[PDB]
Amino acid sequence: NLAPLPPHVPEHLVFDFDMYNPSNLSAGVQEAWAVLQESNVPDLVWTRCNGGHWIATRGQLIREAYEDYRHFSSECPFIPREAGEAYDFIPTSMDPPEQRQFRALANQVVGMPVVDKLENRIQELACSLIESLRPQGQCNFTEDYAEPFPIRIFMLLAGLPEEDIPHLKYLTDQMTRPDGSMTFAEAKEALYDYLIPIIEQRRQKPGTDAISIVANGQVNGRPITSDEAKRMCGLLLVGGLDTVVNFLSFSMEFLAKSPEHRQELIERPERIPAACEELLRRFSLVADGRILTSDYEFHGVQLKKGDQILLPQMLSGLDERENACPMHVDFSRQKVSHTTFGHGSHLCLGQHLARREIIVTLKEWLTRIPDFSIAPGAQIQHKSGIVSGVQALPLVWDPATTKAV
Ligand code: HEM
């Protein structure tokens, strides 16, 4: 299902990439996307899939477009257009200068100081989860750790019942990796049905949780509206439920396959932070975009007002112009160049939280379970979308090679 080419698009710029179902998926999602960076592909292409949209394939172009909010607006950041149209999260569907006041509040809730405060819980849960799995000699990493770990921490931050995970998680997934089961607008509405009553409750009778802080916050010297709060909280939930969860599975799949990298971290722990950056470069996983506010000529291509462009965060660090041997994991790279957390005014506020969850997992898993592999005859499947993911990750290990702490 290819849309007919608009008049302004040169046929030589056509490359029919389906961000939801790329051709090479079997090879790995990162590898499936990297097809865009082969020599046969121009820097900026038009795909006929998902209603037709531009895709910038190079880190330089991506960064430039992200900086340029004048031309590339956040108003409609999702593809397909119906999803980007329905999208009304704050701060993300706003451009500067409006965005700024909303970002400042969201930072209050997810920023550095919050991470510092939650550090002990993060360490506590990681350890508990790992210790609980250790003696089993096998898990489903995705369901057994990658989901519960970051999710439960978010549920704690937010003050929401763990009971709601399944329902919330389902809705979040519909937004980033649509099934066909529900439209974005439907998913969005259902999440909103969930939040509304809670926000109300928390405006009346505030807590210390993230939702209470957001619901009662000040923006541009006046109180936030219920609608604004609902829209911020909807974003926090997606970021909380759908990001770190998927990343940890890519990273663990890779460590399950690379004894030598596991070892390096065990002996030279000072390298964990560097390693984290390298893994965030190699297993980058987000791809959203922007909408042209006007006609604009960008790197010699004519963009029409209302055209959508995908600016895949994932691709910058995979670009050979940015990192030599991009597909190779190297913990001692002199420069780890990526835009995994985004770029420009919408740089991820949850990044500090994400890095602390990642480093804790690596240190604590490797301590207890130094030696593991993917289960014999398990075929690992990746899924593509706005945020890419791993379907299931069967791991096996000999309990006798583990260490209790
Ligand atoms: C592996 C982990 C994560 C990655 C790769 C990531 C990636 C991103 C990207 C690429 C953006 C920019 C989107 C744009 O420009 O349209 C973004 C923004 C954002 N993310 Fe993160 N995210 C992660 C984890 C988190 C977490 C844990 C949270 C907190 C719940 C979160 C909250 C946010 C917020 C609030 C913004 C919007 C900032 C604004 O628009 O000013 N993210 N994230």
Ligand SMILES: CC1(C)[C@@H]2CC[C@@]1(C)C(=O)C2
């Ligand atoms: C692209 C994102 C990763 C960022 C945080 C959650 C997400 C799906 C958004 O809608 C903005």
